[PDB]
Design a protein around this ligand. Structure first.
Ligand code: JHZ
Ligand code: JHZ
Ligand code: SAH
Ligand code: SAH
Ligand code: CL
Ligand code: MG
Ligand code: MG
Ligand code: ZN
Ligand code: ZN
Lengths: 405, 402
């Protein structure tokens, strides 16, 4: 059976999402025959507790020059990261020439604020097209993967870092031991690694299975991160819940013994215990709920198609690949998906090949129903689409359950 | 005989913050108003409330120096509120939102831009003209039974009545909720967000207690006030703004099913013991502790010869300075970005208010952070101060130097 990527012990599988494409490999017609697939399934290490995918997707297939996710296409997320820059600038710098490092800086949504404040900084972004965005904003960015050797080389040329930050990146990286070897080389004396990622507790509580796909190798919790930190000579010393991306936790890891864990760490552990997050049974109940959501969503879409309604998807999310492929949802059930990201438009969604169109197509004419794939952005979207609702249009949500609004 | 402004039963006092000035009344350099600031808990309905009501025309007036749109974080916060209300509550052919206390109208402007019918109530003439300037329909009236009833009659039913940092400012809740009964749709709701009692107690954030904050709402006291007025607490949400708030959703009794969040927050109040006067006494004890340590610290520092400056001329700061006895001998002046407040003096204790630039002229040894709710923003801005060896004094949730 599978072996844990953190500790090497045995992983018990609890959800099999079947054959899946790369979530962010939007296709032209020419690409469909060559299309990569893998088996997506999730399990729990019985030793260390880390919840993780069973099949590692090679990193160069996911992250590469044409990687299509631009972080700065959301107002809520631009403002989130401006506040992140402030937090780090306020609490994690010392001395005359402090140094902020980000792993997975993308289009520079966070570091651009660090730069504008005059603080020395460096991002690692192996996806060149978004890295060019970051650079166009004044950000220093190496087009390379953060791992032990690259971090260690930066330590020599740039000196110690006050903080290494990563958002929606650390869970994308199976090779955590290399990353933390790199952090141990690169951080200064009072340095920390601060990372925020989709939280297992929220996923389980919301039945948000679409948070499970190729780029989410780990579904972190405080318990698993605490064990992982200790294994690599680090220590979980602070936790913070965040509402973005469906529910996340931001973890702060110091070298072991360097800092006093905050009371927040124990509080979140107790939440996990109240949730039963570390019982496989809870995880099995999750998997049954995932199956109910699939049946109810497919039955709803099938009925709306039978009635001759028009259904269109809203937001070509990476997440949505898990939904379409696990649920068997093709162009017969959802005619196209509207998305604001220019590089996603005029292409086909992974595996199930829904056409992606610009947002403007949503109004020409308005559909009867919009399937909200970008449900983590619901208020922004439902707010602005007033003409849709005035014409009687309805929203279909499937988190935390299938429902029509 | 302290009487509950919601149910009229007896209020038991648990904290006395002494003689205080009006919080937002900054002085040019004799006729200075003081009132007694103290807080108690109605033993019958649980509502925590000030023991003396400041007459409202003294507080809310033409030159009121808070514009909501002044802060980036509240601009951002209110954009999201607009999106929330528009997404969740303002459904139908021709939905109508009313706001109590719309101020300079940032929130309603997004409702106006979405093409939704609305009306702000804003009795401060000046902020009201700003809101109008942004396209917001505003009456320059206090929201109360009569004014709300007439809006019902010209404009028809409202889907939502919303209030931010305003409901806690209004003693006359019965009048407000009558207004809302006249004016709300069938499935309409009153949605309001205010500084949360549970956070105040948890953070010993006693500077949240001052003239404008007449009520310190909890889920429990809100549920009881709602039921008194024939409404029902059907939703709650915690918000990090202004030191910790909760947003309460009220519908008419039986109109909606309370969300699971209402019960969870009531549980957290059970766990915190928030409905026990003993817990409030403990809080009052901690406030006294905070004063001792802060005073003792500032005194040590100025004997040691160090220079101290305040950062942010907040409304809240007046409670701290006057309760703690903090005058210009302990803390030399206060920097602030509100032109409105600059080159005037602080209420009661009289620290002078000078613009942000004065902080760097030269930097002090210690900066006493009154605008503690904006710590990241402020501390991230002030890189040279830190680089120069500066230090920050905070007193929430406890006195300490970072
Ligand atoms: C607000 C808005 C968005 N949209 C569109 C824009 C995006 O294409 C998509 C949203 O993608 P959004 O939920 O942010 O991330 P995705 O699930 O892809 O997830 C990606 C991939 C990644 C790194 N692995 C990850 O973990 C999260 C961080 O990011 O929706 C509109 O059309 N109209 C809109 O008004
Ligand atoms: C960010 C920043 C602020 N500053 C300054 C700006 C303000 O004067 C003060 C902040 O006041 P701020 O915490 O918002 O509210 P106050 O307690 O006044 O409270 C007021 C009174 C009122 C309506 N009753 C209320 O409840 C809240 C909503 O608003 O500090 C800087 O100098 N530099 C900065 O970088
Ligand atoms: N080993 C590694 N080092 C640095 N970046 C990496 C990486 N592996 C993947 N990435 C980058 O991680 C990013 C995840 S996208 C998330 C971007 C941004 N921090 C946000 O929160 O929105 C991608 O741009 C991808 O190229
Ligand atoms: N009965 C009443 N009706 C409407 N507005 C009122 C009121 N009593 C006070 N106000 C106004 O309520 C506001 C409180 S200040 C808060 C303003 C804004 N809602 C915000 O959250 O930033 C002031 O503008 C004050 O003039
Ligand atoms: Cl399964
Ligand atoms: Mg230790
Ligand atoms: Mg539009
Ligand atoms: Zn393991
Ligand atoms: Zn009472």
């Amino acid at each position: 059976p599978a072996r844990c990527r953190v500790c090497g012990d045995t992983v018990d599988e609890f959800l099999d999402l079947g054959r899946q494409p790369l979530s962010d490999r939007f296709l032209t017609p020419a690409d469909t025959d060559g299309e990569f697939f893998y088996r997506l399934a999730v399990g729990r290490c019985h030793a260390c507790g880390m919840v993780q995918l069973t099949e590692e997707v090679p990193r160069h297939l996911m992250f590469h020059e044409e990687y299509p996710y631009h972080s700065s296409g959301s107002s809520v997320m631009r403002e989130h990261f401006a506040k992140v820059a402030q937090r780090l600038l306020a609490t994690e710098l010392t001395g005359a020439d402090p140094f902020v490092v980000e792993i997975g800086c993308n289009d520079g949504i966070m570091l651009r604020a660090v730069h504008e404040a005059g603080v020395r900084h460096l991002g690692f972004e192996p996806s060149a097209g978004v890295a060019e965005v970051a650079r166009s904003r004044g950000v220093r960015v190496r087009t390379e993967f953060f791992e032990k050797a690259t971090a260690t080389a930066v330590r020599e040329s740039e000196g110690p870092a006050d903080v290494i930050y990563a958002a929606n990146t650390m869970c994308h990286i199976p090779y955590l031991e290399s990353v933390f070897q790199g952090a141990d080389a690169l951080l200064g004396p009072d340095g920390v690694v601060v990372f925020e990622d989709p939280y297992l507790g929220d996923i389980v509580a919301k039945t948000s299975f679409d948070q499970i796909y190729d780029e989410h190798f780990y579904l972190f919790s405080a318990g698993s991160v605490a064990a992982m930190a200790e294994r690599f000579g680090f220590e979980l010393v602070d936790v913070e819940r965040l509402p973005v991306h469906g529910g996340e936790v931001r973890y702060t890891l110091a070298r072991r013994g360097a800092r006093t864990p905050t009371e927040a760490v124990g509080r979140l552990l107790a939440e996990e215990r109240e949730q039963g997050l570390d019982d496989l049974a809870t995880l099995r109940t999750f998997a049954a709920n995932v199956h109910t959501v699939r049946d109810e969503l497919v039955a709803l879409l099938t009925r709306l198609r039978a009635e001759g309604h028009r259904v269109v998807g809203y937001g070509a999310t990476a997440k949505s690949a898990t939904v379409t492929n696990f649920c068997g949802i093709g162009p017969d059930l959802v005619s196209f998906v509207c998305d604001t990201t220019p590089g996603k438009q005029h292409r086909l969604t992974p595996g199930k090949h829904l056409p992606v169109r610009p947002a403007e197509a949503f109004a020409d004419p308005y559909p009867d129903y919009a399937l909200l794939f970008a449900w983590n952005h619901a208020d922004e979207i439902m707010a602005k689409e007033q003409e849709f609702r005035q014409a009687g249009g309805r929203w279909i949500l499937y988190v935390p359950e299938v429902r029509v609004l």
